[PDB]
Amino acid sequence: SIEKIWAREILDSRGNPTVEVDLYTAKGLFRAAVPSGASTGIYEALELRDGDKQRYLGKGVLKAVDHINSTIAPALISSGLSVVEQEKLDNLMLELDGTENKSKFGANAILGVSLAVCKAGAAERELPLYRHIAQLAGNSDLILPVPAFNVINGGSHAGNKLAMQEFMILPVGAESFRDAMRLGAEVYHTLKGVIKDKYGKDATNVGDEGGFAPNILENSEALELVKEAIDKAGYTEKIVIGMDVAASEFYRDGKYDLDFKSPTDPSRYITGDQLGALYQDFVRDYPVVSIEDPFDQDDWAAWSKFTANVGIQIVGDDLTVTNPKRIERAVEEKACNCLLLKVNQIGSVTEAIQACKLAQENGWGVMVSHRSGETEDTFIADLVVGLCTGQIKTGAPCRSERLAKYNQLMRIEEELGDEARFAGHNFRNPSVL
Amino acid sequence: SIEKIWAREILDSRGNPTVEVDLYTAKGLFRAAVPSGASTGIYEALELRDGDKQRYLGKGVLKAVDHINSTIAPALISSGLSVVEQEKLDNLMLELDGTENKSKFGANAILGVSLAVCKAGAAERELPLYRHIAQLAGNSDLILPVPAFNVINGGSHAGNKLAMQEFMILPVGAESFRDAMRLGAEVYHTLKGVIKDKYGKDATNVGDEGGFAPNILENSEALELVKEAIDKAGYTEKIVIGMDVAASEFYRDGKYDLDFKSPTDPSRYITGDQLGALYQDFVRDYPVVSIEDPFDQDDWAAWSKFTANVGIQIVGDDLTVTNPKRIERAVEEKACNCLLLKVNQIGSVTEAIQACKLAQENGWGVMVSHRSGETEDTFIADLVVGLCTGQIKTGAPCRSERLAKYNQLMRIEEELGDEARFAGHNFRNPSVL
Numbered sequence A, B: 001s002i003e004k005i006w007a008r009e010i011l012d013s014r015g016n017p018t019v020e021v022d023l024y025t026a027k028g029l030f031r032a033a034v035p036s037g038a039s040t041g042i043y044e045a046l047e048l049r050d051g052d053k054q055r056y057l058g059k060g061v062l063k064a065v066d067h068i069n070s071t072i073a074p075a076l077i078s079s080g081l082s083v084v085e086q087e088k089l090d091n092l093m094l095e096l097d098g099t100e101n102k103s104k105f106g107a108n109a110i111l112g113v114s115l116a117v118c119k120a121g122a123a124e125r126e127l128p129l130y131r132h133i134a135q136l137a138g139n140s141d142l143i144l145p146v147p148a149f150n151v152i153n154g155g156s157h158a159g160n161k162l163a164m165q166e167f168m169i170l171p172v173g174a175e176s177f178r179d180a181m182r183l184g185a186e187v188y189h190t191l192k193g194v195i196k197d198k199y200g201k202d203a204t205n206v207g208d209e210g211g212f213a214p215n216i217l218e219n220s221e222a223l224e225l226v227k228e229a230i231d232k233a234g235y236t237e238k239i240v241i242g243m244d245v246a247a248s249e250f251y252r253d254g255k256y257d258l259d260f261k262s263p264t265d266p267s268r269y270i271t272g273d274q275l276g277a278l279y280q281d282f283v284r285d286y287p288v289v290s291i292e293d294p295f296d297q298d299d300w301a302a303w304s305k306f307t308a309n310v311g312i313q314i315v316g317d318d319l320t321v322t323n324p325k326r327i328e329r330a331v332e333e334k335a336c337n338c339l340l341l342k343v344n345q346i347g348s349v350t351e352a353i354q355a356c357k358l359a360q361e362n363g364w365g366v367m368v369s370h371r372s373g374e375t376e377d378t379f380i381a382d383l384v385v386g387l388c389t390g391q392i393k394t395g396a397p398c399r400s401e402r403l404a405k406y407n408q409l410m411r412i413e414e415e416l417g418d419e420a421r422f423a424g425h426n427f428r429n430p431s432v433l
């Protein structure tokens, strides 16, 4: 079936090399690219890097590309397996790599081939990508998700003092997904003028994901900024707020440092119970309906203590890193109620669907996610519709590595027609529609 | 030959609506999107916006999309012309529009259908897109271009006090184009560290084109940063400097204001003689080999005087707007010696090739260009190769709306393979190679 698998090296949205994979069947060419994170969790699968300090400062992927063309490609072509056999083709790759964290061939090399197989399998069944993903996941009631646009930036990769990473907007009161695109964009442009009118003309430049990073320090000031633009645009009750705290980035000696980019002074460190009491204030004072990574990736006691005392959504990112082993622990410990899905964290389409199936079996919500370094690949758009999760965050309505997914989700919605259903206020449990 | 033409509304890299067109033939689906400029010239073809401030601040393209679906689509379909009839189909839309500035259907409507015809016409010929454009333009010796990465930002869409808009790097001394992408990315990441020290952590967020907008006033100060990053990366030998002054954006009462973002003051105004005398210093003190829009779009006396007194490449952008009639005045006035090719300035693939050949047949270099508002479409990547212009500028190695062109340009070099040529130091007239 597979006539040729060919991989190359392309530059992501950050200017860093990443793996692109071309797969040739009888029906044509199928191309897929692998994203790359910035503030990574130490538990995810290995992103294969060259380490050549004189070529892209060590960030090349020539070795992961070589494992594809010289080993994985001839082994999958020799199989005789159709491109529709996603599980069998993914298993055989996990067999050849052998390692637990996919350290032999790299997760970006395995996922790149796995992503192109799934696209080729969709054509062989004469199905769109999202419908083929749904048949793989055992679903049939596709739903368009609620987009979460990261519009205010803080954390390890923002030149400000704001400690928390992402302040997002979720147009839950939209009529359709295309209607949600307009609400998120108009509030994004409205926020651009407010930031320019309070922090200067030189404070509107965007970060890796397209959001603004003004020089603020209090996290409640960021929420007030978001709510200020939400009301100013006239969507006070149709758009709520989500948060990616990424609290692992300032986990100092068992406490939390909401000013970790300042000179290290351990007097300002707060406890997990103090940090939770701050989240509770964010929930009562602001329309915060989702909080991602509220504590450290290993502070399971704080996760379970907080989730049991809140009614909003708790999203595990670095806590679960799309890993079925760590998801089961969070399910048993009730550490969170939502799973952030990043296919490159686990390294294969089959495992990513298995991680999503595991969470949904336990009443969890699932949010398909991007990485800081994205490409022009639009796979996760068809993934979030095929898995029927109800929520996806893949950047602000800015930079086309973010909008190629948003545009595709508008092509998917228009294609579904009357069959399409928008999650809306049911972004947590879309199956009740 | 055309089975169906259907257009929709997507969002470009800045969150603004733009026209995307699907064209169906017996050989499959063909997709193309239309960019949108920021420092737009007055003589550009009309971009039809809705002006309905109930959606997207009045920046929708529902009118232009409707003109495609309701009028242009059934016209080309009922015409029976083959998709390879690029000129017959483009002329069919020009006479149907019947307007000089294309202000009846909008240039974004005609171009999206034109860009999709050229993509479908390449498959009927069983050729890659760049080979079809090479045959549409009478070329045969494909040349890969020298990329110009805008790394320092000023002008009207910047938050700093920098008058001149763009400062670019051109890896003319690279071995191939894949090596040119590595040289530009290494300098871009090197520049990010240089700016981070001299200006702080908060001055590393990117602009519309992925470049930085550091708070600097002197235009010689921007050339000091670019030359420092070039040297601190070890490529003092292989990389030169280009500039997009966009002097039309600070043309004030026949004079020029190098501080138009500060509160206006006529004491700061200088003449084209003073402005031209400043360019003579930039050419000598720095490896500046190309200057775009050194004077206003209407100061033909300053263009003709400066061009005949320098040996560098003088590029016309807002002056010529890819228009055969405005280029024709520039070839007689000898205003410049390089055409900046923007397809949406003129509105059609056929006219964009005619305007390109009018320059190349008068001894002009040609540089294919992007706009500030771009999409994931990569048509101009196959366009700069097909026209054999030898130089393209389409942003910094950041934001995938820019990398989508550079990635495709990397796949074209690999696809051409043994017969692939790089413009190198012959980027102004690659016809010698």
Ligand SMILES: C[C@]1(P(=O)(O)O)C[C@H](O)N(O)C1=O
Binding pocket: A036, A037, A038, A039, A040, A041, A166, A244, A246, A317, A340, A369, A370, A371, A372, A373
């Ligand atoms: C910083 C990021 P990654 O790059 O994936 O580490 C971006 C994503 O929004 N997210 O959830 C993160 O934690």
Ligand SMILES: C[C@]1(P(=O)(O)O)C[C@H](O)N(O)C1=O
Binding pocket: B036, B037, B038, B039, B040, B041, B166, B244, B246, B317, B369, B370, B371, B372, B373
């Ligand atoms: C700012 C821009 P446009 O948006 O096309 O006006 C971008 C391009 O680089 N260029 O030459 C310009 O003048």
Ligand SMILES: [Mg+2]
Binding pocket: A244, A246, A292, A293, A317, A318
């Ligand atoms: Mg996160």
Ligand SMILES: [Mg+2]
Binding pocket: B244, B246, B292, B293, B317, B318
């Ligand atoms: Mg210009």
